[PDB]
Amino acid sequence: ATASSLNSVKDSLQRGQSTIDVALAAGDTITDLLTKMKEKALAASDTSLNTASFNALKADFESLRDQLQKAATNAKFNGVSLADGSTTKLSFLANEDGSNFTVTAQTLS
Amino acid sequence: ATASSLNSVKDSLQRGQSTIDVALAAGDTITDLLTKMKEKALAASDTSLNTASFNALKADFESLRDQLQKAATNAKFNGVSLADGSTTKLSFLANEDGSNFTVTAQTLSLTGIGLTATSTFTDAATAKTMIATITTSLQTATNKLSSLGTSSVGLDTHLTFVGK
Amino acid sequence: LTGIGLTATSTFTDAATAKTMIATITTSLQTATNKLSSLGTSSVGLDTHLTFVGK
Amino acid sequence: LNSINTNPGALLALQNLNSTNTELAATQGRINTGKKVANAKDNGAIWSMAKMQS
Amino acid sequence: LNSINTNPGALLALQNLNSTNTELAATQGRINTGKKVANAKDNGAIWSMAKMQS
Amino acid sequence: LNSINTNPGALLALQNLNSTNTELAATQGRINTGKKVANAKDNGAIWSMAKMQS
Amino acid sequence: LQDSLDAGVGNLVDADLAKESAKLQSLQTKQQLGVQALSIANQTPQTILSLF
Amino acid sequence: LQDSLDAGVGNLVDADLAKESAKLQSLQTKQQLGVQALSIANQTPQTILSLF
Amino acid sequence: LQDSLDAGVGNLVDADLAKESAKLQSLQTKQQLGVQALSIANQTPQTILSLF
After folding, report:
1. Nearest chain H Cα to G44, which residue?
2. Residue B92, φ and ψ in degrees, nearest 5
3. Which of A19, E12, E37, E53 has a CA between 20 and 30 Å from the CA of residue D28?
């Protein structure tokens, strides 16, 4: 019965790995949007720009911010997520007795 | 079923980026059209010109604005457009539950860049006033194309994430 | 279809009607799948009872 | 792992090949145009600045 | 060392080529002008003394 | 010697290829710079000497 | 002033092709390496056939 | 404009052959395993003759 | 400075592929050896039929 019960722990660990892969796929985009937002704000700090260039940099900054919030909202795997902030943690099976392998959520919103 | 449903999201995303490509290809011509009209207004600002050159530059401006309105109205793909102003926006699929990826339409027609179909210049002072409004139309047109390009890059990023 | 939540004339006639129909088709697939799971459990119980009757 | 139906590893290699392919596409675009900001998709703000200056 | 993503040696060779190109540009500029102090960027103090004497 | 887990000979050949690549990089630097003492890493004493000379 | 404006537009948009050629050759190598890796990943499942 | 329409029809229609090669090879391996499984299923009855 | 930072990133993450080629060939050999060892371990029990 123990050897048969272990299959659920195996399936739960594989499910958690797939969820973390989804969260990493969303973070790969969030990091790039943050880098381009740093680029836009850093170029916007320059005082030699005319007003139209500053307005264009501000528009690009706000557009990347909205896209970052979108990419943060799209990160979930079958209704659960470790990046959108919907939950503090998921408790994954670790042994047949019901012990859990906790994985703390990392909000990317 | 949730995995098989994503192919519709992907092909809708591809149709959306194709419409963005068509609108950008039309805007590439509309910008040069606005630039040449700016040069014609600056050339018509002279008080030293004889009347004949003034009517000549005015005829170039007429043909130029007519070509701009035509290139703006020809920008459409699969019966829909983001440059002619026929619709405020178009949505494309972004998730299997029916969530949309909104892409605001950015009108490039004459009325959408602050120009009227009748707008011209009759004397030197009217061309001198026309200079600034043509510059403002070029500025707003470039801002609209910049927004369209940022929406296109976001569309591509969402397509890659949907594939993952 | 009557047990799946669908009518014989069920159909979307508009884009918003299709968007509303998406959740209906999802709920129908879910209830049909639960019904098939119940059938499979009943069949496994039938096989178990047959083996016990043979014993 | 030992699945006759699906293998994750070929899918991962396919994503990596698609990534290097899109990088080669950006390379071919910068080569055949000669500009790092050829159009609004590359960077809209600097493109608008360059258009106004042009 | 045996990386396929980045090669430092090409970067160093390109830096050396840019330095050679800059020296050649300065040489052609002071050839076409005929002056080793053609402007205030060349040397502002000598340019100031020369302009006042002129 | 007869091992699937590791092979020393491939490691030695890679070391020799790396030495050849380093020599080729040093030759590229001497060719594109035109100087056998182009920087302080090349030889610090003669480099500082030529620096004060220049 | 027109020459300075054109020089500034060129500083804004123009790419450094001398940097770019090395990137081209390295991506051309990485492409073949990716094709080979995908081919090996395709070859992997068939080894299970020997057990039957 | 015609170039853009041709590219868009290509996006709507064209397949990604690099995934089709993997689909093909895995399906061949499954076909051979299924033929062997069919042979085993055909050989399952054979034990009945040993009973007599 | 940008060239130095890019060279530092390349030193920090890039793989040394020349070792990876030998590693790849050795693992391709080990995989076939493992399938053969698994097949032998599979066939080993069946000898019990000879005593009956």
Report:
1. H26
2. -130, 155
3. E12
Task: Kindly give the residue spans of alpha helices, DSSP state H, lying in chain I.
Answer: 2-13, 17-43
For chain F, positions 21-50, list CB contacts with chain E under 8 A.
Answer: 21, 25, 28-29, 32-33
Q: Which residues contact D21 (CB under 8 A, 6 or more apart)?
A: G31
Mutual orientation of helices A51-73 and D44-53 as an angle, nearest 10°? 160
For strand A100-104 and strand B89-93, is the pairing parallel, antiparallel, or unpaired? unpaired
Ordered DSSP codes for A46-108: -TT--HHHHHHHHHHHHHHHHHHHHHHHT--BTTB-SSSSS-SEEEEE-STT--EEEEE----
Q: Are D9 and G44 in contact (CB under 8 A)?
A: yes
> In chain E, what residues touch G26 (CB-CB under 8 Å)?
4-7
Distance between I39 CA and the closest CA of chain G, angstroms: 6
In angstroms, rounded to a whole number, what is the distance separating the alpha carbons of residues B23 and B151?
A: 12
CB A70 within 8 A of CB B154: yes
Burial of C45 (0-12, 13-18, 19+ CB in 10 A): exposed
Q: Under an 8 A CB cutoff, do A60 and B146 touch?
A: yes
Q: Which two tokens stand for residue B14?
A: 């591809």
Nearest to C33 by CA among C3, C11, C10: C3
- Best mutation target, D12, D49, D54, to test chain A (most A CBs within 10 A): D49
> CA of I18 to nearest chain F CA: how many angstroms apart?
7
Is residue D52 exposed (0-12), middle (13-18) or buried (19+ Cβ within 10 Å)? middle
Please say whether the beta carbons of C31 and C4 come within 8 A: yes
Distance CA D49, CA A52 (A): 8
Contact F37, F50 (CB under 8 A): yes
Stretch (H or E) spanning A7: helix A2-44
Helix axes I2-13, E8-33, angle to 10 degrees: 170
CA distance A58 to A64: 10
Largest CA distance in chain A: 74
**Among the listed residues C46, B64, H23, the one whose alpha carbon sits nearest the alpha carbon of residue G45:** H23
Q: Do D45 and A56 touch (CB under 8 A)?
A: yes
Distance, CA of C49 to CA of C52 (rounded, Å): 5
Instruction: Work out the angle at residue B15's Cα, subtended by the Cα atoms of residues D31 and B150, and round it to the nearest 5 degrees.
Output: 55
Spatial separation of the C-alpha atoms in residues C23 and C12, rounded to whole Å = 12
The answer to whether the Cα torsion of B9, A23, A17, I15 is positive or negative is: positive
The sign of the dihedral angle between the CA atoms of C21, C23, C29, C31 is: negative
Contact A108, A26 (CB under 8 A): yes
Segments of chain B assigned E as strands:
89-93, 100-104
Tokens 């770019």 map to which residue? G20
